[PDB]
Design a binder for this molecule. Structure first.
Ligand SMILES: CCCCCCCCCCCCCCCCCC(=O)OC[C@H](COP(=O)(O)OCCN)OC(=O)CCCCCCCCCCCCCCCCC
Lengths: 93, 148
């Protein structure tokens, strides 16, 4: 057994009205250092994990696409379009 | 690549035409094809704002350079990739190919339809498509015309 007598005494008896004012500027500085080392360092890894699957497997993020057929309109020099909904699938392996 | 090879080249007029259905058509085609070099203007603007903040609050030049690089990196990351842009470019290229085929047929048959076009202009005051007008006429006949 470890002789933890002093630590046990400290745990049993501690002040219950002592507090220390904290420098808001220094607290904010440390918190924003943590935010800097979070965003500018860990966001690279997080965005890699989030996006690299989306780059190497794009067909699964766009389920439906559209296709068009056109016919001429001579007497009015217009172009008529007919649309169609298709399931986005691989083509020409 | 196959669709772009079939189309050959893309002009801004067709992109403006497809703006009807895809307002971000240009913003997607620029990310899909190597048309022009894309600078992260928004990221650089945010970096300049952070630089002004750092200058005002007397932050180190290393810190402000890092805060300029970071938004630029975010903008580049959110810009490059985006295969949804490639999908929309494929859709636009299909639309453009169909439009060009129809335009080629129009040009081919312009002389043949010239004579008929004058009487059609002199008889019909509407600019709507012949196909749509004929479909409406067919519906009108199916509804009102007596079967007898
Ligand atoms: C559509 C609407 C969108 C709206 C978005 C709004 C965004 C608002 C963002 C507000 C950011 C406030 C940042 C405040 C930083 C305060 C830092 C501070 O108080 O500490 C100063 C300290 C000084 O440095 P020191 O070396 O101690 O030198 C002594 C100089 N007197 O300096 C330091 O110790 C270094 C401080 C580093 C600060 C890092 C900041 C990182 C910010 C990341 C933001 C990411 C946002 C992503 C948004 C994505 C949207 C798609």
């Amino acid at each position: 057994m470890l002789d933890d007598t002093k630590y046990i005494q400290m745990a049993q008896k501690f002040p219950r009205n002592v507090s220390v004012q904290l420098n808001k500027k220094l607290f904010v500085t440390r918190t924003w250092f943590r935010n800097y080392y979070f965003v500018g360092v860990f966001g690279i890894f997080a965005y890699f994990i989030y996006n690299q699957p989306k780059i190497f497997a794009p067909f699964s993020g766009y389920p439906t696409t559209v296709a068009y057929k056109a016919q001429p309109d001579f007497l009015n020099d217009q172009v008529i379009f007919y649309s169609q909904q298709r399931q986005n699938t691989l083509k020409n392996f | 690549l196959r669709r772009k090879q079939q189309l050959g080249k893309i002009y801004p007029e067709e992109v403006s035409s497809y703006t009807q259905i895809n307002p971000d058509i240009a913003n997607d085609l620029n990310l899909t094809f190597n048309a022009k070099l894309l600078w992260p203007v928004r990221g650089m603007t945010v970096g300049a704002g952070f630089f002004a903040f750092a200058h005002l609050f007397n932050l180190p030049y290393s810190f402000r350079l890092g805060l300029f690089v970071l938004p630029t990196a975010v903008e580049l990351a959110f810009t490059w990739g985006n295969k949804t842009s490639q999908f929309k470019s494929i859709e636009f290229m299909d639309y453009l190919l169909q439009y060009r085929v129809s335009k080629a047929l129009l040009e081919k048959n312009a002389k043949h339809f010239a004579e008929k076009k004058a009487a059609y202009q002199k008889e019909i005051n509407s600019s709507q498509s012949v196909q749509d007008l004929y479909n409406q006429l067919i519906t009108l006949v199916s509804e009102q015309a007596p079967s007898e």
